[PDB]
Design a protein around this ligand. Structure first.
Ligand code: CLA
Ligand code: CLA
Ligand code: CLA
Ligand code: CLA
Ligand code: CLA
Ligand code: CLA
Ligand code: CLA
Ligand SMILES: CCCCCCCCCCCCCCCC(=O)OC[C@H](COP(=O)(O)OC[C@@H](O)CO)OC(=O)CCCCCCCCCCCCCCC
Ligand SMILES: CC1=C(/C=C/C(C)=C/C=C/C(C)=C/C=C/C=C(C)/C=C/C=C(C)/C=C/C2=C(C)CCCC2(C)C)C(C)(C)CCC1
Ligand SMILES: CC1=C(C/C=C(\C)CCC[C@H](C)CCC[C@H](C)CCCC(C)C)C(=O)c2ccccc2C1=O
Ligand SMILES: CC1=C(C/C=C(\C)CCC[C@H](C)CCC[C@H](C)CCCC(C)C)C(=O)c2ccccc2C1=O
Ligand code: SF4
Ligand code: SF4
Ligand SMILES: [Ca+2]
Lengths: 79, 30, 73, 153, 80, 739, 37, 39, 138, 37
């Protein structure tokens, strides 16, 4: 039974940050960012070169990375 | 102390720098 | 082995082995005078028959001679 | 950056120029074994091939033999090695008698009847000498241990 | 070498001369059939004995026969 | 991505009465009896009846649906037999004294003796599949639930039949639908394996965990709540597992540590049932579900995200392989035979992995109690896996002769494979001969040294010793694993590596499996036979196109007997005959594997633990000193353990004695087709035909003899049938005689 | 292998000769013979 | 429907119907009069 | 024996020591278009523009190559010549021995290998006893 | 020269090789090399 933290502002802060890092990795990594379904306000995402695909992909990878960070740092203790 | 087979493990590991040093020196000779 | 597997399999297997011998160092020195081929069709039918016969006779001679000499002297 | 070309620039010979078969180290090493070294008379290359195998064949019967659990442990290994070198040289000379009877050239001095006879003679001398020298080191193993450690120095 | 013999029952259907891998056979003119041709076996020292020529012959029993005999390098198909 | 053709073929009965409609060489009519065998051998060769790659794919799709209908009919039969004709209602109460029996026999000719006393007053054949342990692990309690599962399976079989008719006859998908393999693996990973594992994790959390924890506590099945009573009232599940009082709000906030009450990485075996815990089983399926669903979002699809297989393959080029894999995506997306080769290889290796894991980590309650189930399951899945690997070799050869054109792939991996076939087959010849001399020659050396009265010269553990030092080291690492290299694992992964003898109901569930020199020698026999099977099948795959002997094997086909008596005789040069020989070698390899398993568990694992703590084994440690000579295998294994199968007459196990002798008969009968040739049988059939002509009863369909490939095929089919039936009877009569 | 019978040294010398000298000599002569010319 | 008529009339379906019929009458005769070693 | 060789990467299937001790076979064909063929030794190669010279070790490999040159290419290459070259040096000329392929009647060939009977009138081995012959060749 | 440490046979074999086989082999190869052609 590895240690864990229930929920706090710290859990919310770190997973939004890992979502930001996943945004950076997705924009610097995905070959076809604008291709897919059409999107509302695409200038807000990456200036009409970003789709509903890469919305769910990048921040889904953010949730995977944040699950990794939350569980790993709570098991190591420091979170 | 140290084990008998750790020394032979170190020898067979150091067989890899031997091969890579031989190939680096051969490639420098060109 | 001789009765079930037939000559084509063994001939191409021996072709790979012949390549192995002719292309390896220090065994290129030794060369065959008679080119190795697989046993012929009728020849290996005969060889499988000889094996079947010899093993069959040796098994039964061993069994018959040890079963009676096991219980009668 | 292809490392597997065809053999010697010929794309229809049945060989590839792989890093094992046709490297520079393989050329300099396989091509400098006694069976392939340049300029040697067949007697010296047969002698050098023979000693490498007489010294080898001592071990298998010495450590794993019918006599390995007796006081004549090394004598049984030596006897087995002489038996194997005897049949090896008989096979070598029979191969020479068989293969080199039709007249051939002298591009290689080893692939001829006189050359193979010299090779077989050298192999016999080297094989029995290597077998007996490995027997002599193994029989006098206390001496070799003492001189490598310094028990007599 | 194997001997390939062609008999009178040949109908000149050319099936044997193109079923042959080594092209031992060839068609020569003839006057004994409607097709006015009969198979011959000129380069019969190149016959391996595969009997694809006998397999392709439609006439019954057989207008072409392969009679396996003294093996050579050419008639055993050895690349070595 | 979905485009279909509507009503491509009418649903009519008229083609049913005209057999051979599919193949143009059979549509004329039967002149001879070879037409029958060609009608059966070419019935599913969809890729030879036509060459469009679109209609063969539709034919394959609907054939898959019909096969799923067959599998669901069989599975409905299993569940219906467990419902009605079984003592599952009785075995569930007392699964330590009475034995499973899902098949009663009608008494007709005195075969009511096969209704042996299985326990509880029920009379029937004791089954050896782990169906009862499967249904106990999955939470079945009453026969009505099994009956509902059987009815649902029959409904789903009717649905698969309807779906096959739908997708061939009214709405068949186009070729571009099948060549969407990236979307296909997205759905097969995320939706088939991933959601299947997630659904089963949910079932195990909500049905298997409560029902099995109460059945472990000692509650009668009549007092067991129905599985939806743990859903309608989660208070009961809170009574059992205290972590269900918090709900899913720990899950969605990643407070996952509070689920360690039931989602635990406990490891080891449950001491009260002998199976794995369903705690780490449910946790395992949850982890597999998350990992598979994550991996199912890899390959590119309609959306720009994803990761296309073509560019992945083309990116992988090195110095040794030249042009690399650029050419392989067109291979596996334009040929069903390369797909069948890879899927058969991996399904066979998966079935063998299943066999090797379900003995050492028995996943079902009371599976390790009885040795019939364990031995039968290991043997069954070894045989299935070996058959599928031989099929992989077969369809590698079929792809090379049929669906491989070297125009579209020059100097890629497959070309460079074919350019050094002599080197591969050469070194595989050498390793087969090396292992056959140093794995069987050690057995012959031991057998001779034991015959000569020199037991100190043998390769025994009390002689010249060959210890498997690497496997012993790996066993040491896995014993020392759950403290250092797996900190949160409480117990070892399995007790096969080391630990404590797990004795439940007085019988050994799992104890450490020591590896002496006998195991060294048997494992090198395993390596040897696996290598020779790989040699035959790989030689068939490589040399399917052409050899130095017959340079035109590609246009003679795949099933051709020979090229002729020339070149010395090219009697078995096809790739099919390499499948034919690999079947014999697979039979040999897997029979040695299952003999090794059966003897090792009978001598070193299975047995009865006394209350004093001592363990006595079934054959009393024979394997250490007897499994190093061939006479020890013939005397202490085949002769000694067939006393249960040949003395079984006049009892319930007498069907296994009959099946034992039947397997011997079919082996000996197979030798007729294997040893003979077509010529003798054709000129004998001609004399029989004369006898029919003499009295005017000769058939219009001319009786040809079996063809050459037909004769070899029926010989190998009867050989494997006879050997597998003999071993099946021997194992299933030894095992019911040891508990 | 003690020999109680008469001339016990005779198997001592004839088992090596028939086991080795006869096979080695016979296969050597036949190997020269079948491969001559 | 003449296709089911021509398919039920094929050699395997008719030989399996015939073998099932002969097996049925043999099994029924063994069910009613069980053990007939002789007259 | 004029002709640049095909662009082949080399293979283990090919010329063994039989080629440089006794005969090996050369197939020479001319094609306008560069394309890809299957060598009977295993693999795939590149047909050069114009003349090609492929050295093989068996006659069956050369005829199998020529067969796939004829049947597997839409611009059929039928001007292929198969030679038998010896290590001593001389070059024989084998497969289109006359002008035209063996399937076509050249009308100037000789009927050899032809028997004047069918198989029924073949002599029987009892008549030719200890004659050094066999029932076909009498 | 007893060896109390682990693998005492290893200096027993490596002092002759580094003392003789490495110099004899290295000087032999360098003597063939510096005097080649
Ligand atoms: C880098 C920051 C961070 C931190 C501090 C941790 C730390 C840890 N993670 Mg974690 N993780 C991270 C981010 C992080 N992770 C990310 C971003 C992901 C998402 C992809 C993961 C995915 C991941 C999984 C899937 C798992 C961990 C686990 C682990 C634990 C042990 C890992 C280990 O030693 O492997 C062992 C090291 C080896 C070399 C062994 C190799 C084993 C394979 C099978 C061979 C430890 C608490 C493991 C756990 O739950 O432990 C409690 C575990 O299974 N993490
Ligand atoms: C997540 C969606 C989904 C799921 C669950 C399935 C499930 C299945 N597919 Mg399918 N497939 C899908 C989407 C999906 N597919 C996509 C999008 C493609 C388009 C490219 C295909 C293309 C496709 C083909 C071409 C084939 C399959 C086949 C199969 C079966 C695999 C048989 C097996 O291993 O036994 C597991 C079986 C089951 C678990 C039964 C579950 C059945 C219910 C209805 C679910 C299985 C029924 C094969 C088959 O058998 O066809 C019938 C096959 O031939 N699928
Ligand atoms: C994939 C299959 C699946 C399905 C269909 C269910 C379905 C259910 N779960 Mg869940 N559950 C599953 C997987 C599944 N679970 C897994 C994998 C876990 C482990 C993390 C759990 C852990 C779990 C808890 C801890 C709880 C449920 C509960 C519930 C019920 C209420 C859920 C709701 O309304 O929202 C519902 C019957 C709740 C329950 O029992 O109420 C009836 C509840 O407390 N679930
Ligand atoms: C995923 C499974 C898979 C699939 C669907 C295919 C599909 C196919 N294979 Mg097959 N194959 C596989 C597994 C598979 N195979 C395995 C595992 C083996 C190894 C044995 C092979 C070996 C193989 C060969 C060697 C050949 C094929 C061929 C074929 C094609 C036609 C089959 C046919 O007409 O047979 C129709 C069905 C039969 C003839 C039935 C056979 C009867 C069996 C063997 C005996 C009875 C078995 C039974 C359990 C015993 C009880 C019966 C009795 C005692 C009452 C088709 C592409 C052929 C092909 O394409 O070549 C051109 C071919 O020659 N297969
Ligand atoms: C007991 C029966 C038997 C035996 C001995 C063999 C033997 C062998 N088979 Mg096999 N085979 C069998 C039955 C048998 N098979 C049958 C029934 C079939 C099914 C059709 C086949 C199908 C077959 C195929 C398809 C293949 C083989 C191959 C092989 C070889 C594997 C290499 C090996 O094991 O090293 C040799 C080991 C032995 C021969 C056994 C050990 C015997 C001792 C150590 C040697 C004797 C000692 C000494 C020399 C005696 C000399 C005495 C002196 C007086 C002369 C080997 C020759 C494979 C092969 O050639 O691989 C390269 C191959 O591809 N087999
Ligand atoms: C049928 C004949 C036969 C006979 C007589 C022998 C006898 C022998 N075998 Mg052999 N064996 C045979 C067949 C035979 N084997 C076959 C067919 C097999 C294959 C399955 C084997 C497999 C086998 C193995 C694998 C081994 C034996 C070994 C042994 C020897 C055991 C004692 C020993 O260390 O000898 C030592 C060796 C010898 C006595 C050989 C004679 C060499 C000496 C130097 C005499 C030569 C004298 C001089 C140099 C030349 C004189 C010339 C002359 C004209 C005067 C024994 C002499 C063991 C052994 O040690 O072998 C070396 C053993 O390891 N045998
Ligand atoms: C071809 C030889 C042959 C012969 C002459 C018979 C003859 C007979 N058998 Mg028999 N039997 C045969 C082969 C044969 N069997 C085979 C091959 C088996 C194994 C399937 C059986 C298994 C069998 C059973 C189990 C029984 C018979 C019985 C019968 C008897 C009466 C059958 C009936 O319906 O009335 C009769 C004496 C029945 C009987 O009453 O025996 C006395 C009976 O119960 N037989
Ligand atoms: C492996 C060595 C290996 O991985 O080599 C690595 C090498 C891969 O070559 P490259 O570096 O060109 O890799 C490019 C690949 O990525 C192509 O996708 O593979 C070969 O050349 C195959 C050689 C087989 C070598 C013999 C293997 C036979 C099995 C031996 C089993 C021994 C235990
Ligand atoms: C290095 C190397 C290698 C190898 C290995 C080995 C391990 C080797 C072996 C080696 C050896 C194996 C050696 C041996 C040596 C020998 C010797 C050195 C001998 C000597 C001899 C002598 C001394 C003789 C003489 C004599 C006498 C004494 C008397 C009689 C006669 C005579 C005169 C002859 C390899 C391939 C891997 C590669 C890599 C590297
Ligand atoms: C194994 C095998 C081979 C391979 C066999 C070969 C290459 C020769 C086998 C002889 C080897 C060299 C071992 C010989 C040892 C024996 C004791 C024979 C001794 C020599 C006699 C004169 C006694 C075939 O060529 C073959 C051909 C047709 C059908 C089946 C088969 C077949 O099964
Ligand atoms: C006997 C034999 C024949 C003759 C075989 C014939 C004529 C086939 C006879 C088949 C009969 C009609 C039975 C057909 C199948 C049965 C219905 C199977 C019954 C099995 C049930 C118990 C399931 C060959 O043609 C042949 C060809 C090539 C190599 C070996 C042989 C060979 O050995
Ligand atoms: S196949 Fe027969 S019938 Fe036709 S041309 Fe040749 S020999 Fe004559
Ligand atoms: S046996 Fe074969 S190679 Fe010879 S002529 Fe007939 S078909 Fe041609
Ligand atoms: Ca001894």
């Amino acid at each position: 039974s590895p240690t864990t933290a229930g929920w706090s502002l710290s859990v919310g802060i770190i997973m939004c940050l890992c979502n930001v890092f996943a945004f950076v990795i997705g924009y610097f990594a995905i070959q076809k960012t604008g291709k897919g379904k059409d999107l509302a306000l695409p200038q807000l995402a990456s200036k009409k070169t970003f789709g509903l695909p890469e919305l769910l992909a990048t921040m889904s990878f953010g949730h995977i990375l944040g699950a990794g960070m939350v569980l790993g740092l709570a098991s190591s203790g420091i979170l | 102390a140290l084990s008998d087979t750790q020394i032979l493990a170190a020898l067979v590991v150091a067989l890899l720098p031997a091969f890579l040093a031989f190939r680096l020196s051969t490639e420098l000779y060109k | 082995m001789f009765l079930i597997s037939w000559r084509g399999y063994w001939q191409e297997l021996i072709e790979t082995i012949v390549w192995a011998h002719e292309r390896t160092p220090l065994a290129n020195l030794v060369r065959w005078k008679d080119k190795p081929v697989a046993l012929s069709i009728v020849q290996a039918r005969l060889v499988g028959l000889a094996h079947f016969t010899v093993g069959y006779v040796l098994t039964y001679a061993a069994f018959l001679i040890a079963s009676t000499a096991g219980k009668f002297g | 950056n292809q490392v597997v070309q065809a053999y010697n620039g010929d794309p229809f010979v049945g060989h590839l120029s792989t890093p094992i078969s046709d490297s520079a180290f393989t050329r300099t090493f396989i091509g400098n074994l006694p069976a392939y070294r340049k300029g040697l008379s067949p007697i010296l290359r047969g002698l050098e091939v023979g000693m490498a195998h007489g010294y080898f064949l001592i071990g298998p019967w010495t450590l794993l033999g019918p006599l390995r659990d007796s006081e004549y442990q090394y004598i049984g290994g030596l006897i087995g090695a002489l038996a194997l070198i005897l049949v090896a040289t008989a096979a070598l000379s029979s191969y020479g008698l068989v293969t080199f009877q039709g007249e051939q050239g002298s591009g290689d001095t080893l692939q001829t009847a006189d050359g193979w006879s010299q090779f077989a003679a050298g192999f016999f001398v080297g094989g029995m000498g290597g077998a007996f020298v490995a027997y002599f080191l193994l029989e006098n193993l206390s001496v070799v241990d003492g001189i490598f450690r310094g028990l007599f120095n | 070498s194997h001997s390939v013999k062609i008999y009178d029952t040949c109908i000149g259907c050319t099936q044997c001369v193109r079923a042959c891998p080594l092209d031992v056979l060839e068609m020569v003119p003839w006057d004994g059939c409607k097709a006015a041709q009969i198979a011959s076996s000129p380069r019969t020292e190149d016959c391996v004995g595969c009997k694809r020529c006998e397999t392709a012959c439609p006439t019954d029993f057989l207008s072409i026969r392969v009679y396996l005999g003294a093996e050579t390098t050419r008639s055993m198909g050895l690349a070595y | 991505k979905v485009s279909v053709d509507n009503n491509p073929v009418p649903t009519s009965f008229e083609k049913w009465g005209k057999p051979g409609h599919f193949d143009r060489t059979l549509a004329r009519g039967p002149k001879t009896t070879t037409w029958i065998w060609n009608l059966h051998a070419n019935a599913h060769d969809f890729d030879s009846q036509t060459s469009d790659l679109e209609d063969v794919s539709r034919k394959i799709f609907s054939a898959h649906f019909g096969h799923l209908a067959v599998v669901f009919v069989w599975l409905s039969g299993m569940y219906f037999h467990g419902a009605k004709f079984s003592n599952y209602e009785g075995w569930l109460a007392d699964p330590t004294h009475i034995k499973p029996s899902a098949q009663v026999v009608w008494p007709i000719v005195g075969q009511g003796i096969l209704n042996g006393d299985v326990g509880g007053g029920f009379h029937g054949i004791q089954i050896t599949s782990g169906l009862f342990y499967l249904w106990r692990a999955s939470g079945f309690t009453d026969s009505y639930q099994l009956y509902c599962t059987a009815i649902g399976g029959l409904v789903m079989a009717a649905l698969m039949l309807f779906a096959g008719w739908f997708h061939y006859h009214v709405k068949a998908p186009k070729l571009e639908w099948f060549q969407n393999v990236e979307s296909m693996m997205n759905h097969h990973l995320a939706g088939l394996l991933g959601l299947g594992s997630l659904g089963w994790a949910g079932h195990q959390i909500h049905v298997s965990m409560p029902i099995n924890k109460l059945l472990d506590a000692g509650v009668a099945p009549k007092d067991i709540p129905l599985p939806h009573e743990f859903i309608l009232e989660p208070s009961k599940m809170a009574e059992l597992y205290p972590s269900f009082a918090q709900g899913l709000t720990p899950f969605f906030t990643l407070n996952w540590g509070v689920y360690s009450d039931f989602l635990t990485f406990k490891g080891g075996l449950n001491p009260v049932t002998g199976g794995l815990w369903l705690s780490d089983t449910a946790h395992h399926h949850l982890a597999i579900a998350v990992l598979f669903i994550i991996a199912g979002h890899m390959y590119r699809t309609n959306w720009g995200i994803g990761h296309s297989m073509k560019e992945i393959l083309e990116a992988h080029k090195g110095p040794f392989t030249g042009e690399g894999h650029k050419g392989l995506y067109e291979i596996l997306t334009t040929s069903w035979h390369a797909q069948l080769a890879i899927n058969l290889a991996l399904l066979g290796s998966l079935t063998i992995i299943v066999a090797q894991h379900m003995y050492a980590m028995p996943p079902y309650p009371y599976q390790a109690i009885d040795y019939a189930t364990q031995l039968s399951l290991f043997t069954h899945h070894m045989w299935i896996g070996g058959f599928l690997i031989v099929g992989a070799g077969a369809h590698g050869a079929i792809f090379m002769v049929r669906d491989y054109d070297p125009a579209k792939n020059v100097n890629n991996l497959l070309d460079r494979m074919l350019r050094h076939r002599d080197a591969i087959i050469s070194h595989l010849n050498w390793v087969c001969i090396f292992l056959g001399f140093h794995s069987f020659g050690l057995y012959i050396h031991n057998d001779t040294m034991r015959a000569l009265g020199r037991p100190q010269d043998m390769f025994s553990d009390t002689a010249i010793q060959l210890q498997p030092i690497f496997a012993q080291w790996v066993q040491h690492l896995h014993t020392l694993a759950p403290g250092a290299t797996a900190p949160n694992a409480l117990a070892t992964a399995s007790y096969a590596f080391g630990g404590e003898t797990i004795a439940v109901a007085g019988k050994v569930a799992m104890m450490p499996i020591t590896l002496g020199t006998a195991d060294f020698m048997v494992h090198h026999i395993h390596a040897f036979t696996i290598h020779v099977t790989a040699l035959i099948l790989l030689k068939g795959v490589l040399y399917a196109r052409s050899s130095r002997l017959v340079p035109d094997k590609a246009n003679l086909g795949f099933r051709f007997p020979c090229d002729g008596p020339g070149r010395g005789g090219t009697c078995q040069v096809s790739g099919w005959d390499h499948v034919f020989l690999g079947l014999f070698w697979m039979y040999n390899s897997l029979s040695i594997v299952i003999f090794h398993f059966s003897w090792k568990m009978q001598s070193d694992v299975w047995g009865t633990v006394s209350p004093d703590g001592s363990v006595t084994h079934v054959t009393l440690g024979n394997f250490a000193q007897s499994a190093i000579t061939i006479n020890g295998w013939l005397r202490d294994f085949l002769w000694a353990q067939a006393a249960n199968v040949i003395n079984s007459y006049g009892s319930a196990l007498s069907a296994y004695g009959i099946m034992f002798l039947a397997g011997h008969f079919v082996f000996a009968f197979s030798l007729m087709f294997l040893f003979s040739g077509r010529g003798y049988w054709q000129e004998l059939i001609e004399s029989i035909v004369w006898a029919h002509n003499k009295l005017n009863v000769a058939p219009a369909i001319q009786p040809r003899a079996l063809s050459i490939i037909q004769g070899r095929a029926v010989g190998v089919a009867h050989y494997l049938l006879g050997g597998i039936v003999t071993t099946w009877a021997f194992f299933l009569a030894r095992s019911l005689s040891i508990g | 292998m003690d020999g109680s019978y008469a001339a016990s040294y005779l198997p001592w010398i004839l088992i090596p000769m028939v086991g080795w000298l006869f096979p080695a000599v016979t296969m050597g002569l036949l190997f020269i013979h079948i491969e001559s010319e | 429907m003449d296709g089911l008529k021509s398919f039920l009339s094929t050699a395997p379906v008719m030989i399996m119907a015939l073998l099932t019929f002969t097996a049925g009458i043999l099994i029924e005769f063994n069910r009613f009069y069980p053990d007939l070693l002789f007259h | 024996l004029s002709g640049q060789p095909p662009k082949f990467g080399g293979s283990t299937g090919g010329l063994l020591s039989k080629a440089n001790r006794e005969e090996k076979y050369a197939i020479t064909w001319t094609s306008a278009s560069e394309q890809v063929f299957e060598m009977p030794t295993g693999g795939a190669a590149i047909m050069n523009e114009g003349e090609n010279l492929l050295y093989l070790a068996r006659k069956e490999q050369c005829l199998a190559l020529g067969t796939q040159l004829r049947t597997k290419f839409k611009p059929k290459i039928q001007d292929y010549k198969i030679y038998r070259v010896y290590p001593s040096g001389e070059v024989q000329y084998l497969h289109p021995a006359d002008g035209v392929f063996p399937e076509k009647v050249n009308e100037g060939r000789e009927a050899q290998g032809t028997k004047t009977r069918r198989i029924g009138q073949n002599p029987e081995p009892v008549t030719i006893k200890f004659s050094g012959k066999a029932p076909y060749e009498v």
